[PDB]
Amino acid sequence: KNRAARVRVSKGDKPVTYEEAHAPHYIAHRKGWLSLHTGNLDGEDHAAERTVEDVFLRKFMWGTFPGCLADQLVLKRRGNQLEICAVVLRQLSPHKYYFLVGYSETLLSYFYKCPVRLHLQTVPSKVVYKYL
Amino acid sequence: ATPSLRGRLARFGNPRKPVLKPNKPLILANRVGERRREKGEATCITEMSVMMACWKQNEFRDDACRKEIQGFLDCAARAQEARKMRSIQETLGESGSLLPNKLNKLLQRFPNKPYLS
Amino acid sequence: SRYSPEFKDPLIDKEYYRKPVEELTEEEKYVRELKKTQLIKAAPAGKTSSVFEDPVISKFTNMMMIGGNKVLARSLMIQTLEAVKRKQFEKYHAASAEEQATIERNPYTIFHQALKNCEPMIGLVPILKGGRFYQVPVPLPDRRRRFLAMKWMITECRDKKHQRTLMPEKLSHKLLEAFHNQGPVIKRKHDLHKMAEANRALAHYRWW
């Protein structure tokens, strides 16, 4: 049976998110896309280089904001700019958040030669869609 | 008059030898058996025997045995209609005895109680 | 099917609609109003409202076609009809004055009657009784015998005994032999009739 991106049923004590509660056949019906660029449009190029940046950015943020990411990243590209939008927990102190914003923005701007901006949206606790 | 059951089954008070040895307890059930399928009666056989007897005499020519064939043909048409009419009508039509499915809804409203409550 | 169950088959009969309201029976009149509400399927390409439409000559054309080549199947049928037509005109000018009254020249009347002379009355069906298959005589239905007549005529012509003869000349020759109750297709019906009358002792194995 199909397994991809599916959270198997449990007693009911497992909390899943909206994105985690929907399988691949809902990606364009009930879900959007976590990355939005033009590489995959008809007649566009550099789809393999925008993809490698996304795989690394999601890992850079997961290891740079450990335990603070409630949900997956939403990467946005507008021309030269790259916008990282994230939902984070409120456990960490704000002082440490501002440090990580200026460190990640600057480091990633010199690495991908592009203006990078990061927009945090803190949430008290991980939003729960339903309990599987 | 339903046959008697006094001194028939092997018991403690009955001194004599048993008369009946039932393998299933003699207690009415709350349902009846489903009606079996009938083998059926073959139709248009006499018309089918006088039509194949004419072929042998006339060496299987369909110009001299025309009358016989119609008997076998007209019969088949009538027999076919009866089969269609009989199957549908019997279940939908209520004649004589009831059907098990409707008769078991009546026996389950008045179940047999071989226990105390 | 891309049609829903609501869709009903269309009626191409052109003289049915023309029927005056005065002739319409109460049951028929009701039907006509009901059809208005119903959805109707689109008429298929095969059948039109022409006066020359023959359902038996269209079904015989579909039973010869190979791979959807209906232009060739129809071409063979019309050539056969024209070959039967030209062969009877040649048998009519060379006949005596009193022999011309019994010579049919309409190829259709020959096609329908020839197929009626090949329709068998009873067939052999294998029934399993006692772990063995017995070819017991069974009454063929009206459709089955109409289908077998067409299948046998096309099998005999397709049979590779005639080395280099075109189908129109073969089908035309077999249709004229069956019209006079002659030929293998008629003989094939007798052989099925001789085996159903010899094995009539096993006419009780069947139930239906």
Add this chain to the structure above:
Amino acid sequence: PTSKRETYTEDFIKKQIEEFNIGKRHLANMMGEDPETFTQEDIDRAIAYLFPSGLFEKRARPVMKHPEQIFPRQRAIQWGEDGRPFHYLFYTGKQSYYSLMHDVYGMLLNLEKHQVIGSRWLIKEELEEMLVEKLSDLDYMQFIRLLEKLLTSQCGAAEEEFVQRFRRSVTLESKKQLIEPVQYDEQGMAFSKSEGKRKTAKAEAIVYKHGSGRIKVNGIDYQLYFPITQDREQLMFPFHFVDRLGKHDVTCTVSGGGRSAQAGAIRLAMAKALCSFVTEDEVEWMRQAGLLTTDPRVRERKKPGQEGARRKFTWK
């Protein structure tokens, strides 16, 4: 336990009513409209511009509706502080369903003492909204059996109103072909234009009111354009059925498809354009003959694991 059914009280819904009204005045300031005359259709239009979502499911897109159309209707508290249920049939479990059967059975007894198209019985799913009670299929049938029994009897005027509540309405679209508007050309000849479709073929047909039975497909005589007789037979069919051959002049232009797909597309176009020059009764006969219906049969796609659309690879 972590999973609890989201229960919404009257005080919570009352605070949601105030946030929508205030949000309704903010959305009108963004778009520059008048707050007072700002309906719900404009909110749906403004939320689709400000929050453009291409999700196929319309229930998964942003929505800013009134809290009474979002939150579901909930069974209200069924007892006071003392604990006595208001209704006398509370302990049945279906006090709303049984109060209706008790009322209907009470009106059928009075009748004994003193003594249609376009409408359908309320469906099961619509009857659980009037009562806010889950109902089985069998219970719904029992209720319908009493209403029908009510109708057969000589019901009074009041009873008719009662039954009417449970009778929903169905809009039936008259199966009548839409006549095309007869136009006039520069010379003054009357005609009607229509379009047809068959498989991948699309056709436009112009049918002149008076003609000598001349048809030009793409500027070519039909017999030249259609060599195969079958194709010509399809062209004749519409006119032969309405017994008016050799009376109109047709000028069509078919594009796409193949030999047999183009004729079918023209047949349907001529037939639709020939309905403007025939009586209503004749147009219904054409419809019943399958001359005004678009054949929906189109090629079926092939599946990744099979040889064809439905054919399967040989089973080893």
Add this chain to the structure above:
RNA sequence: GAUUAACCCAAGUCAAUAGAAGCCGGCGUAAAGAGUGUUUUAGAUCACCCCCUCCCCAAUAAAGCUAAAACUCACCUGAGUUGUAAAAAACUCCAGUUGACACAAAAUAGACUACGAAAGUGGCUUUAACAUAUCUGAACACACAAUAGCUAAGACCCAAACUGGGAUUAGAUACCCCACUAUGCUUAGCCCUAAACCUCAACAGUUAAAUCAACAAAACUGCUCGCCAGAACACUACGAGCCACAGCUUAAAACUCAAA
């Protein structure tokens, strides 16, 4: 197994062995009501009071009888009859009608439920005839006991182990077909067995209470006799007894398992 730590006892520890604790429980299916009845020595309290299904329906033994079917013979006719999921073999003084004709076996009734100790008994008639005024009471006493079987002399319609033939089958010492014998029957002796099982002892009594593991045919009480104590070895071996000599009855142990 070594090592470390720990537990128990402790100048002891604890491996082998032996012993100490064994009857008031059961017997429809778990091991047990041993085929039936009688009595003895004796035991019981259901024996006096005190009471209610005599006789008759298929008990038994003897003698006699015969309706239906069959065999055989004879006449007449026919050329085949048998066999079956389908064949072969077999038979052809064969088959069908009619008539004559049993030491065999006893439709319907019987939807009855009787007799008798049980076994068992279901065609007709006749004779003789069916223990006991308390209960219980035996592997062995006394007397019975289906079928099968032995010995001897008769009978013989049919059926039929064995055997022979035909077929099936990988094979077929079987199932299917045919034929025939011992045998089944009578008389006279023997044998003494059964899933002889209504697997539910005899007598008396109760229907209340905790109804009662389960299933089966509700659960109990009194009294007595008989039997039984893990499985298998074992319806065995030995011994004894017996008209039984490949027999029956009675009936162990060793080895073995930790289950049945």
Add this chain to the structure above:
RNA sequence: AUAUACCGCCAUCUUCAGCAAACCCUGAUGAAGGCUACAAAGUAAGCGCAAGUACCCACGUAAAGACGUUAGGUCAAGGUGUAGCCC
């Protein structure tokens, strides 16, 4: 090396309709079991089916398809537990 330690991605029954938490009752509180609509102990969130959606509609085709089964397949996609090699 081990798919008989696994994740991951699948096959299959599935061209299925089950699945199930939490309660309740029955059976003397045994394993177990749980329906009758003129209704007799079942109620049920959740998963699935269904519905929605995609494609040319209401049709059809895709997709979807639970829990389980076969220690099914793959350590050779990659990753990885354990054991092993390290001139």
